[PDB]
């Protein structure tokens, strides 16, 4: 074994950490490092569960996909969760699907500690995702302005 050949940067944990996560940081990472669930960001509002299934199945069999919804309008707000049956399949989505297109948008994947009720809603004051509260630009696939 060689350190250089073991390199797997795409599978490394990101800097994100659920602040609402009922638990310690060391514990949240403990779950992230064995998770088979991924958070997917920057999705178009008209991106469907079917399209996410077609794309993410290229790295393995999907157990469940939970679309992110506006805590008020209860509509797709631009993100989702994808759970795989095995860790290896989630990793290949992190290595090869992450950073590629879905509806002509570059999507981002990140390890997730595990789904829970309520985590599928936008924590944004307006209902959608937090990030949309600050964006200045006009995103046709995100409703427009912030």
């Amino acid at each position: 074994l060689l350190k250089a050949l073991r390199s797997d940067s795409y599978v490394e944990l990101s800097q994100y950490r659920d602040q609402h996560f009922r638990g310690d940081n060391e514990e949240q990472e403990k779950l992230l490092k064995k998770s088979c669930t991924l958070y997917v960001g920057n999705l178009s509002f008209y991106t469907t569960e079917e399209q996410i299934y077609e794309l993410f199945s290229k790295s393995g069999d999907i157990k469940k996909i939970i679309m992110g919804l506006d805590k008020m309008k209860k509509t797709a707000c631009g993100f989702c969760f994808v759970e795989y049956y095995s860790r290896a399949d989630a990793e290949n989505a992190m290595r090869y699907i992450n950073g590629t297109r879905l509806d002509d948008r570059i999507i981002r994947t990140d390890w997730d500690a595990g789904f829970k009720e309520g985590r599928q809603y936008g924590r944004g004051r307006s209902g959608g995702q937090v990030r949309d509260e600050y964006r200045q630009d006009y995103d046709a696939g995100r409703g427009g302005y912030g």
Binding site: S7, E54, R95, I97
Partner: protein
């Protein structure tokens, strides 16, 4: 840590020359020999085994260290031989080859005496003399020898040309008697034009013949040690102890034979460097090193693309072409690619990003070529092509010059090209939507576009009051809306006549439960899970499961993706079993969509789930037996009907059927190997039409 980084980094980006860095590293290692000889020996043996793409860089380093310290050189060599035996013992023949090549090139570095290597190679070729041993065993030792020649052939001949000629005689005689039964099962194309897809050993032999004819002179390999002729020449060499190939045992596993992928020649790149020919050792080395690079960096797509693009050689080559070719060679490799299919898609995207002014064009060109050669392309490879191309298109706004492929519009809809376009468009829609795809294609292609994936209800606003259990379902529609329980729906299904197993009860239950959930996948999954108790009851029978599938299909036959996800869910929740799904696939109901990709994706997904079932060897074996039977039967019927009606055997339907059977073996060869006796005695016997039997004999040749 520190030493490992130094050794692994030598040869990379540097303000200094390679020779400079090499001599600079030899010095640093020599100095650490007293306190870290053990660690240095291990690290060197390791790069020799895991970094073959840098073979000459490290053989030179060893040569320089050997010159400064003859003792260390002898320990290194001894250590290499030991690792080789352990590699062979562990059935790691693939890594064993890199070690044999490392030892060979060491001769050029004046570390190992030429006679020693010649003696070892003689023992390698003697393996072809062993009796009652797998051909794949004999092949490997022959391959290990020949694939080493590009590096050490010259030296070995200039010192023992007499001994080398005896070896070549025995080698040639052996190659002449090998069986080629496997070839047809591993070729990406049956046509021998424009490029024959050659058996790996026949190709390598031809390349070595060309090298020998050229006085052992090749123009590609980088040999840093030629810059240290002063030091190395005055360096003492070491002898290799007699080598005895570990005897064949029932636990011996050898590499399967291969067929060389080939799609390019110098005429595909006229305004570029002259592409080394299919029968030159340069082509072999180039491809082997690029495959190795991908093997080393497959987990890091950006780093992998950078390493491929920075690939070095003694003379200029049309690298972009070699890179794209090697990638398709992996993607289309039979039985399977070395890495997960999706990696190749992202890898090509990363390469386009790195060579924006040249790679995209070479790729569009290759895509054009693959399309135009689709007529004799194997179905397994076509599936990967379809999946790559569509995925690729979705990352570039689905932009493509479809009019360049209008030649398919005037062909039989079952023919390869038009079928390919239809499957691609269908795949693109799954990554988008109907109207989207209908707009990206010219009007003359609207026909080849996928129909709109709309649900189908037999008891809808089109139905009639004169339908079996009509009103019973209409009452269920309200039952589901009013949020009822299993027990409630059960009693509602009581008012259904029996034309245990009740066909109508199941039909109205499915035709209604699915329709009222035709919204999303989660809407269906949540319905199956809710009334799961009802499903189990209604589908306890085998005819029950088979009917659930037949109804579900008549409800979602225009939404192939929904069928797939529904079938996968029912199996995982025990609503149906893998056996019922396998029978359903060969049922007359899907006879019209039998050649469509979704059918085989569902089958293979079903087999995969079965392969994961713990403690289900019997069930798994039976799943394969059933599949083979159904194939043997439909293929036989076709073959007999063609002999009785004097019709064409090789029809598009037949090409698919026979290749889908082949695909079962290719995709699950390791498991199926356990069924050899049962298959030779009960299913694939001498009684079968040779067309069918040949597929089984090809499968057996992979490890015979």
């Amino acid at each position: 840590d520190h030493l490992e980084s130094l050794i692994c980094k030598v040869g990379e980006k540097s303000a200094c020359s390679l020779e400079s860095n090499l001599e600079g590293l030899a010095g640093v290692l020599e100095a650490d020999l007293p306190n870290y000889k053990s660690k240095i020996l291990r690290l060197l043996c390791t790069v020799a085994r895991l970094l073959p793409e840098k073979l000459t860089i490290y053989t030179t380093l060893v040569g320089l260290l050997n010159a400064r310290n003859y003792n260390f050189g002898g320990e290194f060599v001894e250590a290499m031989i030991r690792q080789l035996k352990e590699s062979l013992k562990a059935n790691n023949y693939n890594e064993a080859v890199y070690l044999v090549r490392f030892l060979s090139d060491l001769v050029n570095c004046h570390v190992i005496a030429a006679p020693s290597m010649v003696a070892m190679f003689e023992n390698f070729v003697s393996v072809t003399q062993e009796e009652d041993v797998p051909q794949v065993r004999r092949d490997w030792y022959v391959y290990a020898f020949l694939s080493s020649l590009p590096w050490v052939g010259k030296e070995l001949y200039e010192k023992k040309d007499a001994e080398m000629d005896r070896i070549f005689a025995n080698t040639e005689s052996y190659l002449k008697r090998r069986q080629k039964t496997h070839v047809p099962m591993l070729q990406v194309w049956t046509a021998d034009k424009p490029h024959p897809q050659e058996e790996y050993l026949d190709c390598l032999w031809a390349q070595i013949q060309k090298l020998k004819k050229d006085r052992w002179q090749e123009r590609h390999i980088l040999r840093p040690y030629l810059a240290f002729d002063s030091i190395l020449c005055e360096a003492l060499q070491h002898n290799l102890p007699p080598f005895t190939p570990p005897p064949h045992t029932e636990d011996s596993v050898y590499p399967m034979p291969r067929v060389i992928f080939r799609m390019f020649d110098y005429t595909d790149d006229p305004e570029g460097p002259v592409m080394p020919g299919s029968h030159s050792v340069e082509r072999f080395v180039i491809e082997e090193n690029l495959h190795c690079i991908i093997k080393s960096h497959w987990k890091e797509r950006k780093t992998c693309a950078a390493q491929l693009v920075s690939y070095p050689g003694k003379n200029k080559i049309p690298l972009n072409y070699h890179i794209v070719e090697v990638i398709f060679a992996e993607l289309f490799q039979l039985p399977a690619p070395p890495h997960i299919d999706v990696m190749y898609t992202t890898l090509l995207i990363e390469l386009c990003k790195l060579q924006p002014g040249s790679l995209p064009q070479v790729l569009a060109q290759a895509t054009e070529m693959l399309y135009m050669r689709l007529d004799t392309m194997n179905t397994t490879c076509v599936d990967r092509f379809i999946n790559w191309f569509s995925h690729h298109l979705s990352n570039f706004q689905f932009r493509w010059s479809w009019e360049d492929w209008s030649d398919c519009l005037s062909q039989d809809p079952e023919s390869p090209k038009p079928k390919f376009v239809r499957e691609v468009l269908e795949k693109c829609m799954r990554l988008s939507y109907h109207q989207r795809i209908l707009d990206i294609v010219p009007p003359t292609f609207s026909a080849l576009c996928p129909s709109n994936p709309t649900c189908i209800y037999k008891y809808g606003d089109e139905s009639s009051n004169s339908l079996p259990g009509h009103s019973v379902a209409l009452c269920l529609a309200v039952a589901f809306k009013s949020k009822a329980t299993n027990d409630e729906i059960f009693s509602i299904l009581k008012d259904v006549p029996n034309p245990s197993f009740n066909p109508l009860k199941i039909e109205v239950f499915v035709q209604t439960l699915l329709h009222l959930a035709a919204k999303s996948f989660s809407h269906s999954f949540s319905a199956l899970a809710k009334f799961h108790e009802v499903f189990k009851t209604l589908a306890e029978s085998d005819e029950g499961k088979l009917h659930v599938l037949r109804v579900m299909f008549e409800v979602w036959r225009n939404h192939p993706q929904m069928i797939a996800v529904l079938v996968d869910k029912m199996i995982r929740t025990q609503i149906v079993d893998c056996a019922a799904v396998a029978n359903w696939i060969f049922s007359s109901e899907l006879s019209r969509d039998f050649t469509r990709l979704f059918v085989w994706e569902i089958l293979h997904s079903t087999i995969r789930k079965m392969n994961k079932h713990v403690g289900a060897q019997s069930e798994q074996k039976n799943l394969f037996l059933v599949i083979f039977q159904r194939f043997i039967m439909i293929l036989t019927e076709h073959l007999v009907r063609c002999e009785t009606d004097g019709t064409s055997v090789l029809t598009p339907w037949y090409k698919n059927c026979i290749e889908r059977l082949q695909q079962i073996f290719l995709q699950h060869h390791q498991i199926i190997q356990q069924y050899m006796v049962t298959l030779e005695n009960l299913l694939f016997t001498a009684e079968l039409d040779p067309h069918i039997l040949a597929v089984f004999q090809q499968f057996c040749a992979l490890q015979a």
